Amino acid sequence: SMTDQAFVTLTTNDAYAKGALVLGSSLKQHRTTRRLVVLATPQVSDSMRKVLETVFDEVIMVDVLDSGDSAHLTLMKRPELGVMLTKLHCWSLTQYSKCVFMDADTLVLANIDDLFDREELSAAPDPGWPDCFNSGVFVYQPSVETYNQLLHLASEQGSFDGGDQGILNTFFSSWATTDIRKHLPFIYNLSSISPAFKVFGASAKVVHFLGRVKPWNYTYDPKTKSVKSHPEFLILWWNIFTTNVLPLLQ
Amino acid sequence: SMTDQAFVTLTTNDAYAKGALVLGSSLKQHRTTRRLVVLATPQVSDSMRKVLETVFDEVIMVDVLDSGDSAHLTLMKRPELGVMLTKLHCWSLTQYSKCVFMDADTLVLANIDDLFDREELSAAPDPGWPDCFNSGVFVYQPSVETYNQLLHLASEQGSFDGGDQGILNTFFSSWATTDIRKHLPFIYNLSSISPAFKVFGASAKVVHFLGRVKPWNYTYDPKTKSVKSHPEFLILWWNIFTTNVLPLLQ
Ligand SMILES: O=c1ccn([C@@H]2O[C@H](COP(=O)(O)OP(=O)(O)O[C@H]3O[C@H](CO)[C@@H](O)[C@H](O)[C@H]3O)[C@@H](O)[C@H]2O)c(=O)[nH]1
Ligand SMILES: O=c1ccn([C@@H]2O[C@H](COP(=O)(O)OP(=O)(O)O[C@H]3O[C@H](CO)[C@@H](O)[C@H](O)[C@H]3O)[C@@H](O)[C@H]2O)c(=O)[nH]1
Ligand SMILES: [Mg+2]
Ligand SMILES: [Mg+2]
Ligand SMILES: [Mn+2]
Ligand SMILES: [Mn+2]
């Protein structure tokens, strides 16, 4: 419908694929009018890609190890940054005029199509260092130029933790001090999970399972309808997975 | 010199007094041209007030337990909020046109007089919930009206944790979405202490020892010039305390 605009996510393996399936199913559930796109690598199994195609309108293959890939020369300088370099291809999707990137470890609790009212680069503050934006949810404008500049910066600067957040904050360095409309409310990337969430946590639009253990790393027990050691968000992830993802398998 | 403008802090006991002495000494060290004010209660010992008068230009006594105090009726509704109600008296200081409130558990690493270029209410984002501002450092305009409204809100709403942050964020509820100039850089209230601090943590202007254990709760050992179990900020606090506070005692 709005074929010109997309939610874009990323998976480089079958584990994070499970996250993308929950994310995508949650966006469908809350009736997005936009396209759903997943960047996938050849490390994602063919069988899992078949499941991704039931949720996503486009499963777009990216392989930074292929010498024909635009990021390949950069990977040879920074071989440790394969995942980040795959992610940056989100900017190469110039068939779309505007997109919202979302991490595969996010989950949507309401329609968030009003994010397309925003301009590049709009993003929520990161907890822990809130003059940096968290790069798990952001509104951007695909551009070969912007893409090539991000590649250059990745080449020059690298990434201590292998993430793209430092690079995106270096490139978009006016975010902290310029144009409050480019600060997404924290409820669009609620990543503190693990008094304020009493008052405002009920109005979350997006939950982000930022940090070491992802929901799919838990062992789910049908017998108790919970995981094994606000646990609510974790339960909701698994609720979407069991109710909405599993039956796509028919 | 700028007798019209002040840094204002707060202590209700001799422990936090030690914090105020380090804060005040750090502001002097970095050559503030503004006045230094501490709100103190009768629970602060006379002997400690004599030490506070060597650092602070005004030691202003506030006693919410006195029926002549403006906050006393509010305290009888909310007897658990004595400290917060004392703090709110910062707005009653109408001999000043503009002030920066700072928590007694902060410490200054550079001249921060450029905070007086800001307008009420300017404050840094709180880590953990960054659409709320942390109420440990803020620029405000003393006003009997604003004061009386904050008292009313404290009366109506109370405070789950006994802090003023919720009240100040409720009253100043446009902060997250309005006027980026009212967002202080995080380096003016660096309260994550305990990759980003590698890049930007060297340029801190204010450190805030937010959380349970305050620097003065540690046991300092002259023999090692450290505390007993970035530990640097903690060492600096104790460096100011031993070098700059102690010899005020002559
Ligand atoms: O092996 C991997 C690792 C990551 N991803 C994708 O990359 C995203 C980011 O990884 P994630 O594990 O979610 O990182 P966070 O725990 O969210 O860590 C934070 O810090 C990093 C920035 O430096 C960013 O990658 C994250 O968006 C940011 O929230 C994931 O959601 C996936 O979409 C993969 O596909 N495969
Ligand atoms: O017994 C006390 C307790 C606090 N204070 C003063 O109140 C300030 C705030 O208390 P603090 O212990 O610093 O709280 P934080 O650990 O900083 O906790 C956070 O959350 C609270 C808001 O709800 C605020 O009081 C703080 O500014 C905020 O940073 C202190 O610095 C002192 O100035 C006293 O004088 N006596
Ligand atoms: Mg360069
Ligand atoms: Mg009212
Ligand atoms: Mn993530
Ligand atoms: Mn404090």
Q: Do A185 and B177 touch (CB under 8 A)?
A: yes
Q: Which residues does chain B have within 8 Å of residue A198's beta carbon, measured at their own beta carbons?
A: 160
The CATH number assigned to the domain holding A203 equals: 3.90.550.10
For residue A78 the two structure tokens come to 């920074």
The atom of ligand 1 lying closest to the CA of A163 is: 23
- CA dist B34 and B204 (Å) reads 20
- CA dist A214 and A221 (Å) reads 16
For A195, nearest residue in chain B (alpha carbons): B160
Provide the b/e sequence for B131-157 (b: ≥16 CB within 10 Å).
bbbbbbbbbbebeeebbbebbebbbee
Q: Number of folded domains in chain B? A: 1
Residue matched to tokens 């650092």: B55
Neighbours of ion ligand 5 (CB under 5 A): A 103, 105, 136
For residue A109 the two structure tokens come to 């609790």
Rounded to 5 degrees, φ, ψ at A127 are -65, 155
Strand, coil or helix: A250: coil
- CA dist B135 and B121 (Å) reads 10
Q: What is the DSSP letter of B69?
A: S
- CA dist A38 and A57 (Å) reads 8
Helix, strand, coil percent content, chain B, rounded in steps of 5:
40, 20, 40
Q: Which residues contact B209 (CB under 8 A, 6 or more apart)?
A: B105, B106, B107, B193, B215, B233, B234, B237
Q: Do A130 and B130 touch (CB under 8 A)?
A: yes
Task: Please state, in angstroms and as integers, the Cα–Cα distance from residue A245 to each residue in A14, A18, A25, following that order.
Answer: 14, 9, 7
Residue A125 CB–ligand 1 contact under 6 Å: no
For A186, nearest residue in chain B (alpha carbons): B131
Measured from the alpha carbon of residue B153, the closest ligand is 4
Q: Which of A128, A197, A198 sits opposite B127 (nearest CB)?
A: A128
Q: In terms of residues, how long is chain A?
A: 250
Residue pair B88/B171 in contact (Cβ under 8 Å)? The answer is no
Residue B134 CB–ligand 2 contact under 6 Å: yes
For B136, the domain range is 1-250
* Other CB atoms within 10 Å distance of the CB of residue B67: 9
Residue pair A101/A70 in contact (Cβ under 8 Å)? The answer is no
Strand, coil or helix: B107: strand
Q: Do A160 and B125 touch (CB under 8 A)?
A: no
* Other CB atoms within 10 Å distance of the CB of residue B192: 18
For residue B5 the two structure tokens come to 């403008």
Residue pair A200/A3 in contact (Cβ under 8 Å)? The answer is no
Helix, strand, coil percent content, chain A, rounded in steps of 5:
40, 20, 40
Closest CA to A168 of A215, A114, A112, A123: A123
CA B131 to chain centroid: 20
Q: Which amino acid is at B62?
A: V
Provide the b/e sequence for A74-97 (b: ≥16 CB within 10 Å).
bbeebeebbbbbbbbbbbbbeebe
Residue pair A102/A7 in contact (Cβ under 8 Å)? The answer is yes
- CA dist B210 and B226 (Å) reads 20
For B183, nearest residue in chain A (alpha carbons): A177
Quoted resolution (Å): 1.9
For residue B10 the two structure tokens come to 């707060």
Strand, coil or helix: B9: strand
Q: Which of A127, A185, A197 sits opposite B127 (nearest CB)?
A: A127
Residue matched to tokens 């595969």: A104
Residue matched to tokens 């928590």: B103
Q: How far is A125 from chain B (nearest CA, A)?
A: 6
By what method was this entry solved?
Answer: X-ray
Please name every residue paired with B8 in a beta bridge, in sequence order, or none if there are none. B37, B101
Q: Under an 8 Å CB criterion, which residues of B touch A?
A: 124-132, 160-161, 166, 176-180, 183, 185-187, 192, 195-200
CA A143 to chain centroid: 18
- CA dist A245 and A224 (Å) reads 19
In sequence order, which ranges of chain A are alpha helices (DSSP H)? 14-29, 46-55, 72-77, 82-88, 144-157, 165-171, 196-199, 232-240
CA A249 to chain centroid: 23
Q: Which amino acid is at A108?
A: V
Q: In terms of residues, how long is chain B?
A: 250
Q: How many CB pairs under 8 A join A and B?
A: 71
